[PDB]
């Protein structure tokens, strides 16, 4: 039996908030990236460092450690770019028209307008950011959504099923705590979960581009990033 199911709603929220990885900085040097080499250079380096924190974050997600090591590997391989992207979208909420990869790495679409086949994914992320902003997405809600992504995206099962249900209860708990009516609660729950389909879409388009970046020779990929990428092919 997992202790994840024995947690109260507030305890579930506390666990996820405590498990949060930090916001990492990009390398300094104030050169605004306008090349496919420099920007993919910066993004690859950042993502590689973020991955290490994500792995240790995932281990602190209730229910996750109760899975076999191979199941843990599978879920992370499936969801890692989704998780990176929803984090990016969250960080960029207070900066409309901009993507905050790091506090010292703020990119707009005009920089995405470089690099063949990235401005489209750029625009999609910006739209998701704006949507989260217009919905007034809360931090407690964000960490629930990110945990859902981790557990759901590669779920294809009963343990994960119950944990996913538990997070649903936790989201509802937070909305009721925020003073929302029953109708506002299930409407907001639906709105948040439907956005997860778009995050999935953006991740898959991202994998194609990363694979495309790999097939050329531009940025050295870390062995870790290469293995995470190869898992999708």
């Amino acid at each position: 039996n997992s202790l994840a199911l024995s947690l109260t709603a507030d305890q579930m929220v506390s666990a996820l908030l405590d498990a949060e990885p930090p916001i990492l900085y990009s390398e300094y040097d104030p050169t605004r990236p306008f090349s496919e080499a420099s920007m993919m250079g910066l993004l690859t380096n950042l993502a590689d460092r973020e991955l290490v924190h994500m792995i240790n974050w995932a281990k602190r997600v209730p229910g996750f450690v109760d899975l076999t090591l191979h199941d843990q590997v599978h879920l992370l391989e499936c969801a890692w770019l989704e998780i990176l992207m929803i984090g990016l979208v969250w960080r960029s909420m207070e900066h409309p028209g901009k993507l905050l990869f790091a506090p010292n790495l703020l990119l707009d679409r005009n920089q995405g307008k470089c690099v063949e086949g990235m401005v489209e994914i750029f625009d999609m992320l910006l739209a998701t950011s704006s949507r989260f902003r217009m919905m007034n997405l809360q931090g407690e809600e964000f960490v629930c959504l990110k945990s859902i992504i981790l557990l759901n995206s590669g779920v294809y099962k009963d343990h994960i099923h119950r944990v996913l249900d538990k997070i649903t209860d936790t989201l509802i708990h937070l909305m009721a705590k925020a003073g929302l009516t029953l109708q506002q609660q299930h409407q907001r729950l639906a709105q948040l979960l439907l956005i997860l389909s778009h995050i999935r879409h953006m991740s898959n388009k991202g994998m194609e581009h990363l694979y495309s970046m790999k097939c050329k020779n531009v940025v050295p990929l870390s062995d870790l990033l290469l293995e995470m990428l190869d898992a999708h092919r």
Binding site: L69, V73, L76, D223
Partner: peptide, 10 residues
Amino acid sequence: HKILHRLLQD
């Protein structure tokens, strides 16, 4: 084999 298998243990 996989780096991920190692990192998930630590």
